[PDB]
């Protein structure tokens, strides 16, 4: 019970903003999914399904998105802003709009392998693990 509201589902819920997707949002989600090295083999219907279940998440500078060693619950596409990747406390890259992340824990069914921080204010499209894994499990 002490652990019920710790974890990605609780954290991301706190960053959710209800939003109608605009044409440019749909377009960018589709191109970004064609660009993830796990989703590059998805067909257009699989992409459309993922896109339908994407939600909008808003972050301020220095907010944590993913923490290395935790259970993963989401796959993300960067919509705006800059997100840094840290592997064992060393920053390995900075990602911007169109990049995606969070697939590895979900595919391998393992802990998050890096920490991702909003370096600037930024926004993400995120889909829950259930939909993501189901789309790949075929
Ligand atoms: N481990 C690792 N993850 C990275 C790297 N660059 C981007 N990532 C992403 O950071 C994510 C952290 O959560 P996941 O392990 O689910 O998936 C990881 C990748 O999508 C990298 O160089 N190493």
Residue numbers in the entry: 21 to 158
Authors' account:
Previous work has demonstrated that one particular kinase, known as cyclic guanosine-3′,5′-monophosphate (cGMP)-dependent protein kinase, or protein kinase G (PKG), has essential roles in multiple stages of the parasite life cycle. Selective pharmacological inhibition of Plasmodium falciparum PKG (PfPKG) blocks the egress of merozoites and gametes from erythrocytes, as well as inhibits the motility of ookinetes in the mosquito and invasion of hepatocytes by sporozoites. The cellular functions of parasite PKG are regulated by allosteric and cooperative binding of cGMP, similarly to how mammalian PKG is activated. In contrast, PKG enzymes of Plasmodium and other apicomplexan parasites have an extended N-terminal domain that features four CNBs upstream of the KD and are monomeric, resulting in an effective regulatory stoichiometry of 4:1.
